[PDB]
């Protein structure tokens with residue numbers, strides 16, 4: 160157990176990347192709790208398969224996020240995975256949906272990270288799942304999403320300095336296409352996405368979890384305030 | 399008049415960088431409207447001096463921002479300048495203050511830009527005042543502010559592609575230290591800031607306005623989705639170890 164005896168909280172752990180992260184930390188021996196909102200059956204099934212603890216918390220509710228983090232006690236590792244996509248022509252998207260995206264994708268990582276730092280010991284780790292779309296030229300239809308993922312860069316740089324004296328690192332993982340419900344490897348966008356990539360496949364959720372596990376471990380104590388891209392070199396058109 | 403016959407709306411134009419932008423567009427012949435929230439006397443003095451129109455609108459109120467942009471009619475140029483700073487140790491800052499910063503610095507530029515594109519013609523221009531702190535390693539105590547300024551980068555890149563078919567460009571201007579009420583050139587941080595710079599002075603609000611004016615003009619129709627830094631090369635500490 161690389162993480163035996165460690166307390167891990169994963170926000171948004173019921174499916175996809177988050178569920179892969181739950182499984183990895185469980186396999187490595189950690190005491191894992193994770194949150195869900197809309198996928199209760201998936202959460203219960205994951206808890207039964209792994210022994211992790213499922214907890215309802217809507218990441219769009221600031222005080223609920225703060226409360227779940229605070230009521231976890233001293234955390235060793237916080238992973239903020241929960242995020243949503245609202246895609247379409249900017250002039251046709253509903254403003255309330257956009258603001259919900261900002262609340263989940265920007266506000267919740269900020270407040271969860273600060274709250275976690277209140278009780279986290281020296282050696283603590285905070286990981287946020289961002290996106291390579293925080294760096295790249297976004298396709299049409301994802302401007303607010305891209306903004307929310309670029310927000311995490313300045314957020315992590317700044318919080319790294321706020322948390323440095325406490326012995327806590329904070330880092331952002333930026334995936335390219337990963338095979339999940341939100342980005343199925345078999346979906347109709349498969350061929351286009353792969354035409355933009357050096358490694359012509361979707362990543363697997365377990366690969367994101369592997370990068371998270373390295374950053375959360377003892378070899379990464381000098382790694383903080385940084386964005387770590389795991390994307391198959393996405394963004395160049397096949398010629 | 400480089401901007402004669404153009405209609406300009408500046409969100410947050412009562413003081414500082416915003417006020418310099420109002421003055422520049424007025425001097426260049428535009429019909430200028432600008433918003434204010436807390437500085438009514440400054441706004442009324444600026445309107446009297448320039449002839450620009452001062453309009454109350456609180457940028458923390460999404461529907462009010464959308465409404466002032468919408469009721470402006472077909473804009474030629476939108477400048478989103480309004481922004482706030484909330485600084486201090488992250489574990490001591492009030493959560494409602496942080497969320498207000500997000501609402502002004504992130505939500506408002508997005509909704510204002512989208513609303514402006516509804517009636518803006520081909521050749522239109524949208525400019526957002528970001529910060530070099532969207533790129534640089536932030537000092538302690540401005541993590542949320544830095545996040546709000548980095549948010550604008552993905553925002554502008556994405557909206558550039560949404561707005562491309564409409565003939566509208568969108569760009570972010572990223573200033574370094576500029577002499578304003580929020581960052582006075584004679585303030586106690588002067589020497590430290592200049593110790594981090596190649597050009598050892600605060601910028602003037604008029605210089606930010608000059609960069610905005612070039613980007614808003616007809617020579618910049620191929621310039622969109624980009625971040626334009628005007629910072630005196632901020633971010634490297636003065637030393638003499640290479641002598």
Ligand SMILES: NC(=O)C1=CN([C@@H]2O[C@H](COP(=O)(O)OP(=O)(O)OC[C@H]3O[C@@H](n4cnc5c(N)ncnc54)[C@H](OP(=O)(O)O)[C@@H]3O)[C@@H](O)[C@H]2O)C=CC1
Nearest residue numbers: 171173174175176195196197198218242336337339341342
């Ligand atoms: N797949 C990809 O290609 C990429 C993904 N990402 C990022 O990875 C992260 C995970 O993505 P992915 O696994 O594909 O997403 P999925 O949509 O497959 O999974 C989303 C997960 O986030 C949780 N979640 C969503 N909203 C909330 C909320 N309000 N409160 C609590 N939990 C919530 C969901 O739980 P529930 O269903 O219970 O609500 C679910 O477990 C996101 O931040 C996303 O932006 C980034 C780049 C690429």
Ligand SMILES: NC(=O)C1=CN([C@@H]2O[C@H](COP(=O)(O)OP(=O)(O)OC[C@H]3O[C@@H](n4cnc5c(N)ncnc54)[C@H](OP(=O)(O)O)[C@@H]3O)[C@@H](O)[C@H]2O)C=CC1
Nearest residue numbers: 410412413414415434435436437457481529576578580581
């Ligand atoms: N000066 C600097 O060194 C730098 C500044 N910037 C950015 O430049 C922009 C202007 O900064 P600066 O001139 O120094 O700021 P100041 O504090 O001097 O002026 C702020 C301006 O924004 C307006 N404003 C603030 N909040 C609101 C609101 N809720 N609704 C409407 N208007 C509002 C203010 O109007 P009122 O008082 O009427 O509310 C005022 O006109 C900001 O976005 C800032 O982040 C970026 C990098 C460096």
